[PDB]
């Protein structure tokens, strides 16, 4: 107990720990490594060399016992494996060929060589690497066989065959190479078993979403690990790949170099891709959607409502003028189309990934897009591309936090990047250049996979420079070019409608019309009031072709641009249909 007590238990945690040397030279040393039970040396005098001797036995055979309950439970290859593994560090560290260093590595090295030193009494480095090499070559045999002794019937009779002498960093290689493939399974295995097929979209919660990350980060780190034993092999031999030791290893696995030996199979994408989000993202942004509109058109409904989505209904909602908002606003009128703004909802939020909140804003950009597209598939593309443009920069002001409604569904979106902020200066101003500076990072690819749905993509200008208009003024207009259309439309029903009486309950027609015009008009006072309230508090001062609502409607609502507003247009029957909808008697 004395020995084991010197050196330490063992952690059954197998990982590689990456530093770098006194020569600026990054290195990855095995935890094995590390705990090498190498205690007994410096609790000991030294006082002759068979007293080196007798200390070294101890070594060797301790390391055995720490490591057999170190892989209690564990397959009984490791444990033969790590016996070797060790027995060559014994001999690799001992003979000036380590690349491990600090703490007891370089504590007992120098020790090792000071009183050996002392035995052949000679101070010259070479030598002394020398002369241990031949000492344990006449030693390395009664070594091996004390180390397994309490051992032998606890591995195969194969793994009771002294190790075959090699460089330390070609035994690393194919130690950390056995770690990694073993690794490997393990978590690809967690992996099929909490994802299944994702079939039932499995990929979009945290049961498969966990396991597959976790294996993600796992890729990251053994690719900078191995970028690492890569290139210490081949500057260790003459930076060339010797023996194709290295070729070889990749082949051996079926992949031909580092890149590919971590790209990620179709299997995984398969499996950890929530398909109803990330799937689409990256046709948005790569695959075919990205070129061909009439493909980013197509609309998975499967995937829609799975994300908390569905068609724009095919009725009209009313401009809501009496929301909680106005409270703060009074005046403003949310746009239907803001009302049913696709969010989402989604377990990707909650957790508060950044990269998950990122791929939750896009899948709610596309769908919103496509819905859209849907809707308005008969308007031209001038007038389409300023629909897209409305949602685009009311998404922006959800996540800015400017955004008016502040609806559930809209602080839920804010909220939740706020949790993405791992900063603990949480207060309103502090918030709210992170989110700001967020958006700016995000909202050019948030509008490349949007503006996807267009036939010509370019034909969308100042889309930016659009959202950095204020919200209450992009809906007013928005309400403006709306209002004039459905106006259009009314008095073409007007005009269809009378000329088929002409040849073979007008009152009805138009008392619903009558109604129609007076909603409309409670709505354009509200919002004119807002527009000249905050136009004296002098709030559009730093917006060109703004500092009468009524004729900031008309050039900016393409719309209107055949229509003025005078208090006929408020009438309950259009002027030329005044006299018209009166002498109902007809
Ligand atoms: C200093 C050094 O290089 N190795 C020593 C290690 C490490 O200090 C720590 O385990 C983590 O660094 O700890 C031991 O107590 C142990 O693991 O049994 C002894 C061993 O000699
Ligand atoms: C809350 C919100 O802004 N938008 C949501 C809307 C609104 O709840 C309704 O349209 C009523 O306003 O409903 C959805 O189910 C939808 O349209 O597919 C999800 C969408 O995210």
Same mark, same amino acid.
Request: with cysteine; net charge positive; glycine share 4%.
């Given at each position: 107990?004395?020995?084991?007590?010197?050196?330490?238990?063992?952690?059954?945690?197998?990982?590689?720990?990456?530093?770098?040397?006194?020569?600026?030279?990054?290195?990855?040393?095995?935890?094995?490594?590390?705990?090498?039970?190498?205690?007994?040396?410096?609790?000991?005098?030294?006082?002759?060399?068979?007293?080196?001797?007798?200390?070294?036995?101890?070594?060797?055979?301790?390391?055995?016992?720490?490591?057999?309950?170190?892989?209690?439970?564990?397959?009984?290859?490791?444990?033969?494996?790590?016996?070797?593994?060790?027995?060559?560090?014994?001999?690799?560290?001992?003979?000036?060929?380590?690349?491990?260093?600090?703490?007891?590595?370089?504590?007992?090295?120098?020790?090792?060589?000071?009183?050996?030193?002392?035995?052949?009494?000679?101070?010259?480095?070479?030598?002394?690497?020398?002369?241990?090499?031949?000492?344990?070559?006449?030693?390395?045999?009664?070594?091996?066989?004390?180390?397994?002794?309490?051992?032998?019937?606890?591995?195969?009779?194969?793994?009771?065959?002294?190790?075959?002498?090699?460089?330390?960093?070609?035994?690393?290689?194919?130690?950390?190479?056995?770690?990694?493939?073993?690794?490997?399974?393990?978590?690809?295995?967690?992996?099929?078993?909490?994802?299944?097929?994702?079939?039932?979209?499995?990929?979009?919660?945290?049961?498969?979403?966990?396991?597959?990350?976790?294996?993600?980060?796992?890729?990251?780190?053994?690719?900078?690990?191995?970028?690492?034993?890569?290139?210490?092999?081949?500057?260790?031999?003459?930076?060339?790949?010797?023996?194709?030791?290295?070729?070889?290893?990749?082949?051996?696995?079926?992949?031909?170099?580092?890149?590919?030996?971590?790209?990620?199979?179709?299997?995984?994408?398969?499996?950890?891709?929530?398909?109803?989000?990330?799937?689409?993202?990256?046709?948005?942004?790569?695959?075919?959607?990205?070129?061909?509109?009439?493909?980013?058109?197509?609309?998975?409904?499967?995937?829609?409502?799975?994300?908390?989505?569905?068609?724009?209904?095919?009725?009209?909602?009313?401009?809501?003028?009496?929301?909680?908002?106005?409270?703060?606003?009074?005046?403003?009128?949310?746009?239907?189309?803001?009302?049913?703004?696709?969010?989402?909802?989604?377990?990707?939020?909650?957790?508060?990934?950044?990269?998950?909140?990122?791929?939750?804003?896009?899948?709610?950009?596309?769908?919103?897009?496509?819905?859209?597209?849907?809707?308005?598939?008969?308007?031209?593309?001038?007038?389409?591309?300023?629909?897209?443009?409305?949602?685009?920069?009311?998404?922006?002001?959800?996540?800015?936090?400017?955004?008016?409604?502040?609806? !559930?569904?809209?602080? *839920?979106?804010? $909220?939740?990047?706020?949790?993405?902020?791992? &900063? %603990?200066?949480? #207060? @309103?101003?502090?918030?709210?250049?992170?989110?700001?500076?967020?958006?700016?990072?995000?909202?050019?690819?948030?509008?490349?996979?949007?503006?996807?749905?267009?036939?010509?993509?370019?034909?969308?200008?100042?889309?930016?420079?659009?959202?950095?208009?204020?919200?209450?003024?992009?809906?007013?207009?928005?309400?403006?070019?709306?209002?004039?259309?459905?106006?259009?439309?009314?008095?073409?029903?007007?005009?269809?409608?009378?000329?088929?009486?002409?040849?073979?309950?007008?009152?009805?027609?138009?008392?619903?019309?009558?109604?129609?015009?007076?909603?409309?008009?409670?709505?354009?006072?509200?919002?004119?009031?807002?527009?000249?309230?905050?136009?004296?508090?002098?709030?559009?001062?730093?917006?060109?072709?703004?500092?009468?609502?009524?004729? !900031?409607?008309?050039? *900016?609502?393409? $719309?209107?641009?055949?229509?003025?507003?005078? &208090? %006929?247009?408020? #009438? @309950?029957?259009?002027?030329?249909?005044?006299?018209?909808?009166?002498?109902?008697?007809?």
């Amino acid at each position: 107990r004395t020995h084991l007590f010197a050196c330490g238990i063992k952690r059954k945690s197998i990982k590689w720990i990456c530093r770098e040397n006194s020569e600026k030279i990054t290195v990855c040393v095995p935890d094995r490594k590390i705990q090498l039970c190498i205690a007994n040396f410096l609790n000991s005098r030294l006082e002759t060399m068979e007293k080196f001797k007798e200390i070294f036995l101890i070594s060797v055979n301790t390391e055995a016992k720490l490591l057999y309950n170190k892989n209690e439970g564990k397959d009984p290859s490791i444990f033969c494996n790590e016996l070797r593994n060790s027995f060559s560090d014994f001999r690799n560290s001992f003979i000036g060929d380590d690349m491990d260093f600090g703490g007891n590595t370089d504590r007992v090295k120098g020790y090792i060589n000071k009183k050996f030193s002392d035995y052949y009494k000679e101070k010259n480095v070479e030598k002394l690497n020398n002369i241990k090499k031949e000492w344990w070559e006449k030693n390395k045999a009664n070594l091996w066989n004390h180390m397994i002794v309490n051992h032998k019937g606890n591995i195969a009779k194969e793994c009771a065959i002294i190790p075959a002498e090699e460089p330390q960093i070609n035994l690393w290689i194919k130690e950390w190479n056995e770690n990694f493939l073993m690794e490997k399974k393990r978590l690809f295995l967690n992996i099929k078993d909490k994802c299944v097929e994702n079939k039932k979209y499995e990929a979009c919660f945290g049961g498969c979403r966990l396991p597959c990350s976790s294996y993600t980060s796992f890729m990251k780190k053994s690719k900078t690990q191995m970028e690492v034993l890569t290139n210490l092999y081949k500057k260790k031999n003459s930076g060339v790949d010797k023996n194709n030791f290295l070729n070889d290893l990749f082949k051996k696995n079926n992949k031909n170099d580092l890149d590919d030996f971590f790209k990620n199979e179709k299997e995984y994408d398969d499996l950890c891709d929530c398909r109803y989000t990330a799937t689409i993202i990256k046709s948005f942004l790569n695959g075919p959607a990205k070129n061909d509109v009439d493909i980013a058109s197509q609309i998975n409904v499967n995937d829609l409502r799975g994300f908390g989505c569905n068609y724009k209904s095919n009725n009209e909602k009313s401009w809501n003028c009496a929301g909680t908002f106005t409270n703060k606003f009074p005046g403003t009128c949310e746009p239907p189309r803001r009302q049913t703004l696709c969010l989402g909802r989604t377990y990707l939020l909650h957790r508060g990934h950044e990269e998950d909140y990122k791929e939750h804003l896009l899948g709610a950009s596309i769908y919103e897009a496509q819905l859209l597209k849907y809707k308005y598939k008969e308007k031209d593309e001038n007038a389409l591309c300023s629909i897209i443009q409305n949602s685009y920069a009311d998404l922006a002001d959800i996540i800015k936090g400017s955004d008016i409604i502040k609806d !559930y569904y809209g602080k *839920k979106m804010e $909220e939740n990047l706020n949790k993405v902020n791992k &900063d %603990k200066k949480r #207060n @309103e101003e502090s918030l709210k250049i992170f989110r700001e500076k967020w958006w700016d990072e995000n909202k050019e690819n948030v509008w490349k996979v949007m503006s996807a749905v267009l036939k010509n993509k370019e034909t969308c200008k100042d889309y930016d420079k659009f959202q950095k208009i204020p919200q209450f003024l992009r809906w007013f207009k928005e309400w403006g070019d709306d209002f004039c259309e459905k106006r259009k439309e009314k008095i073409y029903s007007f005009e269809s409608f009378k000329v088929e009486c002409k040849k073979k309950t007008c009152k009805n027609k138009c008392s619903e019309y009558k109604k129609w015009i007076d909603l409309k008009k409670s709505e354009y006072e509200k919002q004119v009031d807002k527009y000249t309230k905050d136009k004296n508090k002098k709030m559009y001062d730093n917006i060109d072709e703004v500092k009468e609502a009524n004729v !900031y409607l008309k050039e *900016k609502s393409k $719309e209107c641009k055949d229509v003025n507003f005078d &208090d %006929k247009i408020f #009438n @309950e029957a259009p002027n030329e249909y005044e006299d018209m909808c009166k002498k109902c008697d007809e």
